Amino acid sequence: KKHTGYVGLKNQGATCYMNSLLQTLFFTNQLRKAVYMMPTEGDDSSKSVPLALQRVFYELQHSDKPVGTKKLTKSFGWETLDSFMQHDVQELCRVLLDNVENKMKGTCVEGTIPKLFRGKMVSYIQCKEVDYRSDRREDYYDIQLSIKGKKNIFESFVDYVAVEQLDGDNKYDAGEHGLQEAEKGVKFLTLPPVLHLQLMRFMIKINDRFEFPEQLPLDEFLQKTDPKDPANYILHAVLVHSGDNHGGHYVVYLNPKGDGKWCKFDDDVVSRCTKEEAIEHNYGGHHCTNAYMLVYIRESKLSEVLQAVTDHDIPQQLVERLQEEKRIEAQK
């Protein structure tokens, strides 16, 4: 008696935001395939994060039952009762991705992580009185957006690049010119194919209303724009939290194929839903249900990022290794 086309993950503790992120990464099809190509054949099943992530993805791809993640949590060492509460998604993500990005070094799939998530920035400082400016290019794999006092994602972005004033006791150490008054701000050089945006709702938990669109145009927050690739993004996933600070239930809504057809992933339960329930209903009310992380995929990168994944895309040597574990556990 089944349906959706997708299977869920099992509830095994206060993993909190974990399950949502796992589903989010699994449907980043280009990322999934790259993981399956990792040289884990010689790794230790209970100490290898790369191998643990492969296992979950394989399970999520084949299994007809909810998937477990115990070997995964043991993998990165987050096993204490509140180990996931004292961390945020932004940190979990760096754990997994940083581990996978490094394991792919020396392979045919090396650099898949940066290609998908890394973007370029530029932080500057300009002195008011004296002529001195300092430039520093930066790399980022995600964006933390201020939400308190903002209506939509557009104002958060307006505020993000806003010029900052450095004055008396804020005065900038200009070295040879001694302390000075100056401005500091940021400007975007590039925006990645997959955009990880975390909404700064936790600092407390801010449940004010905050709107985000299905289609997001960022072309204007970029230094130089370039036709043939307007920075227009398509909403892929909405990571939702319900309740107050330490009172919760985490869920995620995704339209996996980028076709506008959404589903709700509530741990082991996966069901179809409307756009409104995934988008508008999660803007925040005047009622605590809402989104804390959004995922957008560039309109021009949608096809490649959402590449169809086949059973053959998983190395036979991996397939067998995983399949044997199923037998060992079947004989239990």
From Swiss-Prot:
**Could you identify this protein by its name?**
Ubiquitin carboxyl-terminal hydrolase 7
Q: What is known of its domains?
A: The C-terminus plays a role in its oligomerization.
Induction info reads: Up-regulated in regulatory T-cells (Treg). Down-regulated during neural progenitor cell differentiation.
Which residues are in the USP domain? 7-299
Q: Which domain of life is it from?
A: Eukaryota
- Modification after translation (UniProt): Isoform 1: Phosphorylated. Isoform 2: Not phosphorylated.
Quaternary structure annotation from Swiss-Prot or TrEMBL: Monomer. Homodimer. Part of a complex with DAXX, MDM2, RASSF1 and USP7. Part of a complex with DAXX, MDM2 and USP7. Interacts with MDM2; the interaction is independent of p53/TP53. Interacts with DAXX; the interaction is direct and independent of MDM2 and p53/TP53. Component of a complex composed of KMT2E/MLL5 (isoform 3), OGT (isoform 1) and USP7; the complex stabilizes KMT2E/MLL5, preventing KMT2E/MLL5 ubiquitination and proteasomal-mediated degradation. Interacts (via MATH domain) with KMT2E/MLL5 isoform 3. Interacts with OGT isoform 1.
Which tissues show it? Answer: Expressed in neural progenitor cells (at protein level). Widely expressed. Overexpressed in prostate cancer.
The residues of the intact protein that this chain contains are 208 to 554 of 1102
Q: Subcellular localization, per the record?
A: Nucleus; Cytoplasm; Nucleus, PML body; Chromosome
The active-site annotation reads: C16, H249
The record's function comment reads:
Hydrolase that deubiquitinates target proteins such as ARMC5, FOXO4, DEPTOR, KAT5, p53/TP53, MDM2, ERCC6, DNMT1, UHRF1, PTEN, KMT2E/MLL5 and DAXX. Together with DAXX, prevents MDM2 self-ubiquitination and enhances the E3 ligase activity of MDM2 towards p53/TP53, thereby promoting p53/TP53 ubiquitination and proteasomal degradation. Deubiquitinates p53/TP53, preventing degradation of p53/TP53, and enhances p53/TP53-dependent transcription regulation, cell growth repression and apoptosis. (Microbial infection) Contributes to the overall stabilization and trans-activation capability of the herpesvirus 1 trans-acting transcriptional protein ICP0/VMW110 during HSV-1 infection.
Q: Tell me its family.
A: Belongs to the peptidase C19 family.
Associated disease: Hao-Fountain syndrome: An autosomal dominant neurodevelopmental disorder characterized by global developmental delay, varying degrees of intellectual disability, autism spectrum disorder, poor or absent speech, and mild facial dysmorphism. Most patients develop seizures. Additional variable features include hypotonia, hypogonadism in males, and ocular anomalies.
